[PDB]
Amino acid sequence: MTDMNILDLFLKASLLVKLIMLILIGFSIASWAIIIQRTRILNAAAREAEAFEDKFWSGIELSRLYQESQGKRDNLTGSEQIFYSGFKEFVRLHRANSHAPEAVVEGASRAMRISMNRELENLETHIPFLGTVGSISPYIGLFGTVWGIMHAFIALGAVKQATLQMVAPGIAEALIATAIGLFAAIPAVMAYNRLNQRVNKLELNYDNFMEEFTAILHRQAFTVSESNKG
Amino acid sequence: MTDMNILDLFLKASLLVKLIMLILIGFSIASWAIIIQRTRILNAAAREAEAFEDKFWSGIELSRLYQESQGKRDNLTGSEQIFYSGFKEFVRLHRANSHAPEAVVEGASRAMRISMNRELENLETHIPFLGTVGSISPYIGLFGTVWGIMHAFIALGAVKQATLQMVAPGIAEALIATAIGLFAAIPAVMAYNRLNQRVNKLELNYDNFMEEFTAILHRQAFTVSESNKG
Amino acid sequence: MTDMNILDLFLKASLLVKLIMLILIGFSIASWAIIIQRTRILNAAAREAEAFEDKFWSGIELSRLYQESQGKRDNLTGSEQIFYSGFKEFVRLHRANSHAPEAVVEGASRAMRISMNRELENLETHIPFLGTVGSISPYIGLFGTVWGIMHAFIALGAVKQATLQMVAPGIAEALIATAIGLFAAIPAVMAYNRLNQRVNKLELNYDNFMEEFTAILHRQAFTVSESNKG
Amino acid sequence: MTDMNILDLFLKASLLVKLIMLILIGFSIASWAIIIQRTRILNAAAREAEAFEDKFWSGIELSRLYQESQGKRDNLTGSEQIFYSGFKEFVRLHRANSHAPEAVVEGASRAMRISMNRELENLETHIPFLGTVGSISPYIGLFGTVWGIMHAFIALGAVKQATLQMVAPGIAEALIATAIGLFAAIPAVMAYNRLNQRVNKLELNYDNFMEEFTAILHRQAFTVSESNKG
Amino acid sequence: MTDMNILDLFLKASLLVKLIMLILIGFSIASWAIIIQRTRILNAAAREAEAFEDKFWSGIELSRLYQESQGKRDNLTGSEQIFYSGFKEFVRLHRANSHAPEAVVEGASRAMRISMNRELENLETHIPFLGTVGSISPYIGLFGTVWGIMHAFIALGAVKQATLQMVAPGIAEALIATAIGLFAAIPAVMAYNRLNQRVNKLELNYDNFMEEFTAILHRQAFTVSESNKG
Amino acid sequence: PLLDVLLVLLLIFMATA
Amino acid sequence: INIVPLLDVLLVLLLIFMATA
């Protein structure tokens, strides 16, 4: 019995076939890599945002907190960056329009929304690649199968005596193409849904915190406004 | 008549394919057990939430109900857990910082959010795995089927006189893989949608409770604070 | 010439294949039944809700309207049912906490949310079955089709000599199976989307009503409180 | 020689197959009709909205424009109808309950949104019909193709030895349903999506008109009410 | 030996078949050129938008950056175009409508939104082409492939001793159209996704900058108007 | 897809014997 | 409706179907 390992069919495969196969292989490799690195990123972000909110809710001085965060402004992440941006813009706005706590509050809110959306993009990098990959790869398995059966027909039509042997390589090509497509797809679908869920969770967290800090800052601006007139 | 029955084919299954089959069977059993355990948890939680809702809406005194919850505080769950967390936080902050009713209210809302999300982690647990199964399983079955079928099919084309026997048993077996995969997927997906539905129901119930309790706590803070100043 | 009857194919079907075809038949039938019943109920509810919304926004007196509804209360639904319950809660909170128009209004709105969620459930009934069936059936059909195919190759490998004639019945049956699954699936899915859309429409309308009644109740409570004092 | 006319199959198609072709072609005609009619309607709606915006933002006072609109109030669509309804309701609410300009704004805004909802309903009429037909027709064709499939199989079942002579009529007969289904499907989805896009454009435009006009009405109400108390 | 190469059978495609193949080739060329041009356009627009935002958020004077944008007004896109138009409309309405800084800035912001809509429409141009072409060209190729193969098997139907070589050539000549269509569709879908993602990135760019500039312009108008009444 | 292999089944059915 | 896993099989079917000769 021939040691009919898949490597043999690949090596005997036609040029376009091998190109397609390697395209799929690269997609799969990059897919796993993206999933891994992004997952680590999101875990770190989740832990740090959680801890940051926990400490912030502890009732510590807001100004002291901003001092400490400014201590490493070079390395703010998620909740910390949002707090720094909101509080700094609050400082400036109150110095300008303490008379309009609503206006100052809305300005700080815009600032925090900007910081948040920037952070969210920073997090979401390459997820859409996963979405596209899970969208396309089976179509690739298809077209590969199609080219395989095409060469199969070319071979079968050129022999005086019809024999199923001539099409065997073509359909073997189809099979290998489709297998690689499936293999690339599985992680795509799995991790894509997982990651979208996690990032939406974080987005909820940040939005909630944003609203909370918003009310807190509206209150604080009003308090400082009333105190200044004492 | 060869006893070419499915069990034995599985017994003599090829290396990689049999490995895949065992993987899928484990997926199936794990889906089964996850469904069972989580179903138990969710049923009991629905029951306990039901009773707690009914007892709370009864107009019963808040302090009395809190004391009764406290008596088993070590084993609180669901709306009971949320109520304990929020109410204890409220009392502590009221006794420390009664002067800022808004602040105490906000802290209480924070606490109820915290406990509630903890509860949702406890409940939702492992469901995303059910989703992951109902998502991947078909493709795994495809993949194993394809690999083995390729082996047999191309084993055919290496003999001068293509003969059906060298393949048909092999492919008959290989298809068993996709069969099993889909067999696991079906109950998986059914249970997935069911459980997620129930979970959303729970979520809405809890959120409505959180809001009503929030209103009550706001009212109590304001009423007591203004009464003590009369 | 003999009429080409699927019956000869049926009675040759294996245990499992016939049973699965029956599953599909039943699921399809119940799909149709649910589609019809739910569709009629939803349409009529929407029309009655429109009529009641226009009647309320007709400038009709709130108390007059409530007496009129209370006359036939045993048959309230949707907008009018929520109006009845919410008006009841507004009445009782105003009687107990006229001194707190805002708090009274909040308890009013909560009674409204209670009734609304009740109606959303009452109306949604069985729809998730629609989504489940639509989303699950194709896999069922593929499973049966694969099973038939497996038994076909069982018939084929157990014969030394190959031929097309021995296998056609199994192929025909299995393909019929896939077809049946798809037949059942498509209606379910289409209906699921459509119905959920119309349900969301109703839900939006109801929430709009709740908030509008809430604010009108705010004005009503404040006005009743103040004019009776001056 | 005999010309290889395509109808050579249609005439020999089995009665079921001709039935499937007839139903699918009827849905094709309906697709074309609703597509074309909605196309003309949306083009005209866009042009009328352009026309009304051009004069509304030309600086003309809204009282004279309102009287012009009243001249044909029987005949209002889109931005113009929103304009007239808002004008009328705003005037009546401001004259009736001037004490609450916010109430004037709210009631008028809900009236404007009502008119916009009705106009959107007008634009969307039967569009979902196009979407559903495009999604579904290939499956109606599936039914007939499947019946032809089974007819062909029973056709080959007549001869002891299978061969490539017998059922080709049955095969090309079966496929007619599929082809007619795709014929029904292509334009239906094409136009469904295209008119979806155009209607999104129109809905956005009407919403923006609602926003600016609602703000204009709010400013008019507030300024008039404040001045009345000078 | 006859040179039955891919190009050979393509050229020897039957009239309908050759025409379908040519249509697919045209779609391919169009999608390729559109993709490259729009991709470089997106790169250029993103480069310009990011550079202009970096310049704006450096503290540059509104009047100075404003007339600087006036200098290349005829070659402004995206964020730079939106800012230039926004400050122009704001200034113009303010001079005409200084009495209503709010009304001025809201009119200018809506004009900015209108410019954003126009530029986004410019961006999406040729993109729906790509999406729907990728969707449908599979249909165009496959339909014809299907019919050709039907006729081929009708022809080989007359043969007493069936041999695939009487149909393998026709089957391949048919399948060529399917293969080319799908090969051209793959990149269509990939580019559609990638460029649409870029498009949404730019759209968010523009909405966020519009909101920032509108708030800043509200502040500017308020300050100038209040100083004007000193 | 559903439609696409309606043929393939019919075809390779028609051509196998 | 997920469709990917559907017919990627059937092609496979007709390969043994071919093996029948």
Author numbering:
A (entry chain E), B (entry chain D), C (entry chain C), D (entry chain B), E (entry chain A): 1 to 230
F (entry chain G): 20 to 36
G (entry chain F): 16 to 36
Publication passage describing the model:
The energy-dependent step in Tol function is removal of TolB from its complex with Pal in the OM, which is catalysed by TolA in the IM and energised by PMF-coupled TolQR.
TolQR isolated in 0.01% lauryl maltose neopentyl glycol (LMNG; w/v) yielded higher order complexes in native-PAGE, within the range of 150 to 250 kDa, consistent with a TolQ pentamer (110 kDa). The structure of the complex was determined to a resolution of 4.3 Å using cryo-EM. A short two-turn accessory helix (A1) forms a tight collar around the top of the hydrophobic membrane-embedded region of the pentamer, which likely stabilises interactions between the pentamer and the TPH. TolQ structurally most resembles ExbB with three core transmembrane helices (T 1-3) and three accessory helices (A 1-3). Comparison of the cytoplasmic face reveals that the TolQ pentamer adopts an expanded conformation relative to ExbB. An outward (into membrane) rotation of transmembrane helix 2 (T2), transmembrane helix 3 (T3), accessory helix 3 (A3), and accessory helix 4 (A4) generates this expanded pore conformation.
